[PDB]
Structures are given as structure tokens and as C-alpha cells.
């Protein structure tokens, strides 16, 4: 038939803002024809991995529902967007499963986001008391306890706040510039 | 084993700057928080600053809020004071102490502690 | 002004061996979570941690020390104290900032 009604894509890789790590956004994608090989064969990307399909076999294959992750990290932080993988992002900010059947893509992002003088917008969680479970989300900001005595209200020796900032400056060295990171799973049932 | 080594003595010409490191093993150095104490011969204790490593965020005594510097480096597990603008006061003995903690948690006080630098000023 | 400032009531403090002995260490205000600590220096060494809370014990601290405490006033007992016992003693307030020392206190045999 006449090819028509394509996925909306571009309003996801080009966009206005991008939601922080900790509270990374999602959308879901149905009933539209998408074009991997526009993605794939796009020259302004810098890490491209498939998990469970070739680039020719996203073309190939028919999935029920398709959906869309998005949240900005540093440079060195990109290596964790992989089943099995170790570190502070994985382990209490976004944690993939064992078993991934998707995509993930991830391109510098130098000039829109660290704007002279220094930036504020993105934040990231230090510390938690428990495992991230696969696609196991939280927003809750309540004060970090460490220790058996209990904590009130104010932040002190054993009770501390729960995000930390990111502090972005387009002086800053080879690995510690900013990079936007897209996570694509695909579903059939 | 739990150890926190220091560098050891300095000596320094009035009007100059000090540095002293502190270095820890044995525990969950990224959920600790590090506490500095200066000693005059036979004058009790002062205590001046303490630092949260995860996020090394500082806060200082009003006293040595403008000559005190206190840096953490995660990847060699470094603690870093810098003091500038030294004066006959400045002989004393430096101390940094730090609990032990697991991934988990903290022990809730201060046990880990180091052995003294001196600090001379001619 | 400074926010808390605190203070031990003996001075230079002398008792036969084995003597049972008392000390307090009292506060302007009711610090926060009751953070106060007590450690033990000796002339040429470090302090090492002796009791937190007020009531706590630390990993190799003998059965022969005892402490309580609440809200201004704080006290620490030593029933049979041992010739390696007799030291200098400070108790410390960590709950707001800024965390101060007392005066010390030093125990001598008779």
C-alpha cells in the first residue's frame, strides 16, 4: 500500500528539554509504521547498540507496542545502559533487565545543555536503601537515613539529601561533558 | 583491617601555605564523612570542619572559614586540607577522623581515627 | 554568639586503684538526636572512641564503663579503673553545627 503515517520519532529526539535521570521519561508508541533505518543510518550519532536485533532485523520484524526512554547523563556514565553492568546510575537511578530485547543510542549533547557559567537543571540519586528493581521508578525526595537512630526534618551527620546536581561547564574535561541517552524496547505478545 | 594513614610532618616559613593528606582503607569509603581537629601542645582540642565524601559538600568553623580548604579525591580515596596564610599560632599537631561504614550504613560515631601530623611554623 | 558551649564539672581528679569515680559533662540547650561522645587521649597518641549516645559501648570497651544521659546532663561512671585507665577524657557534642569540645579532665592515681 501507499507507505503513510509515520512514528513521531523526531518529536522525541528533537525536543525542547529532557527530563533528569532520576525521573526519566517514557512514552509509548502504537499503531504507526517506523523507519529504524533512517535512525541507524543518521550520521549525527556517536554510540548505537542493538540488544536481541540486527539492524536489517528491525526492519524485518512486527512488534505489538514500542516504548520510548529518555533522561541525560555524563560521559563516562554511558557504558552502564547495558543488561548486567555495575555502578551508582545503574544501581539506583535505571536498571535494565537481564534479558533486554531493545535499543540504545546515545549522542553528545555539548552545546545545549552547558551554557556559560556553569548549569543546575539536571540532578541524580546518590544514595538509596535498596536495589533498583528492572524499570522500578522513584520521586520521593524524603531524607536519607543512614545509622539506627531515628532522623527528623533537618539534614545532618547520618541524614542526607537524596540528589546531587551535575555541574556542567563547556570548559570542562573530555569525559564530563553532557550526553543524551534513548533506550527503545520493543514488545510482542 | 581498617587503617587511616597520614602523610606526616611539615615545616613552613611564616606567611606560606600548608598542605596534609590523609589517606583510608578498609571500609565503604563513598558513604563516610571525614571531620578535622587541630592540637596545641597542652591546649585541648579544636574542632574546625567537616565534609560528606559522596557529595563533598563542606562546612567550616567561622574561625577557619576563610583559611581552610577541604577537598576529597574518590578514585585514590584522598582527604585534602590546604591552609594559607600561616602564623606562629599554626604549630600544632592535625587530626582527621571518619566512622566505618558498610554499603548500607553508617555506625553512627566517630572511631577510625588517625595517628597526627605535625605542623611546624619557624 | 557561639550555639552551644560545654562544660565538665571535675578538675584534676585523683583516686586510689580501683576506686569508683564519676565525672559529668553538662550543655546550655538539648542537643539534637542526644549526639554526644566521649574519648580517651594519653601524652603522645591519638583519642579513640569511647561511648556514643551517651549509652552506647564501643567494640573493646570492658564491661567496667558506664555512661547515661539526657537532654543538658550527661555523666560517665568507671567503677574499677585500671593503672592503664588513668588518662585525659574529652566529651564531644555533635549535633548542630558548630560541634565543640569541653575542657578535659585528668585522672590520676592516689
Known amino acids: 500500500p501507499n507507505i503513510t503515517n509515520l512514528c513521531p520519532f523526531g518529536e522525541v529526539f528533537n525536543a525542547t528539554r529532557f527530563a533528569s535521570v532520576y525521573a526519566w521519561n517514557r512514552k509509548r508508541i502504537s499503531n504507526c509504521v517506523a523507519d529504524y533505518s533512517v535512525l541507524y543510518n543518521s550520521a549525527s550519532f556517536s554510540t548505537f547498540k542493538c540488544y536481541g536485533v540486527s539492524p536489517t532485523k528491525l526492519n524485518d520484524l512486527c512488534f505489538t507496542n514500542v516504548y520510548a526512554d529518555s533522561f541525560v547523563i555524563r560521559g563516562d556514565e554511558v557504558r552502564q545502559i547495558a543488561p548486567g553492568q555495575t555502578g551508582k546510575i545503574a544501581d539506583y537511578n535505571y536498571k535494565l533487565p537481564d534479558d533486554f530485547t531493545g535499543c540504545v543510542i546515545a549522542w553528545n549533547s555539548n552545546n545545549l545543555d552547558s551554557k556559560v557559567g556553569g548549569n543546575y537543571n539536571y540532578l541524580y540519586r546518590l544514595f538509596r536503601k535498596s536495589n533498583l528493581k528492572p524499570f522500578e521508578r522513584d520521586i520521593s525526595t524524603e531524607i536519607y537515613q543512614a545509622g539506627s537512630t531515628p532522623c527528623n526534618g533537618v539534614e545532618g551527620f547520618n541524614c542526607y539529601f537524596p540528589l546531587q546536581s551535575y555541574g556542567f561547564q563547556p570548559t570542562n574535561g573530555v569525559g564530563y561533558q553532557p550526553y543524551r541517552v534513548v533506550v527503545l524496547s520493543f514488545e510482542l505478545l | 583491617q581498617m587503617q587511616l594513614e597520614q602523610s606526616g610532618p611539615e615545616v613552613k616559613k611564616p606567611g606560606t601555605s600548608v598542605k596534609v593528606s590523609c589517606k583510608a582503607s578498609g571500609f565503604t569509603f563513598s558513604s563516610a564523612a571525614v571531620q578535622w581537629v587541630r592540637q596545641a601542645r597542652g591546649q585541648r582540642l579544636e574542632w574546625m570542619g567537616w565534609?560528606?565524601?559522596?557529595?563533598?559538600?563542606?562546612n567550616y568553623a567561622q574561625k577557619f572559614q576563610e583559611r581552610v580548604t577541604i577537598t576529597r579525591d574518590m578514585s585514590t580515596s584522598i582527604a585534602y586540607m590546604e591552609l594559607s596564610s600561616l602564623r606562629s599560632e599554626d604549630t600544632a599537631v592535625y587530626y582527621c577522623?571518619?566512622?566505618?561504614?558498610?554499603?548500607?550504613?553508617?555506625?553512627?560515631?566517630?572511631?577510625?581515627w588517625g595517628q597526627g601530623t605535625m605542623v611546624t611554623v619557624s | 554568639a557561639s550555639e552551644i558551649v560545654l562544660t565538665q564539672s571535675p578538675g584534676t581528679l585523683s583516686l586510689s586503684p580501683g576506686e569508683r569515680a564519676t565525672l559529668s559533662c553538662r550543655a546550655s540547650?538539648?542537643?539534637?538526636?542526644?549526639?554526644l561522645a566521649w574519648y580517651q587521649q594519653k601524652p603522645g597518641q591519638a583519642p579513640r572512641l569511647l561511648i556514643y549516645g551517651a549509652s552506647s559501648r564501643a567494640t573493646g570497651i570492658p564491661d567496667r564503663f558506664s555512661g547515661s544521659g539526657s537532654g543538658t546532663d550527661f555523666t560517665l561512671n568507671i567503677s574499677r579503673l585500671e593503672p592503664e585507665d588513668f588518662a585525659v577524657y574529652y566529651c564531644?557534642?555533635?549535633?548542630?553545627?558548630?560541634?565543640?569540645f569541653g575542657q578535659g579532665t585528668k585522672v590520676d592515681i592516689k
Open positions: 540547650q538539648s542537643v539534637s538526636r542526644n549526639y
Open positions: 565534609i560528606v565524601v559522596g557529595s563533598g559538600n563542606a
Open positions: 577522623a571518619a566512622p566505618h561504614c558498610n554499603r548500607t550504613s553508617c555506625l553512627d560515631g566517630f572511631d577510625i
Open positions: 564531644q557534642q555533635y549535633g548542630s553545627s558548630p560541634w565543640t
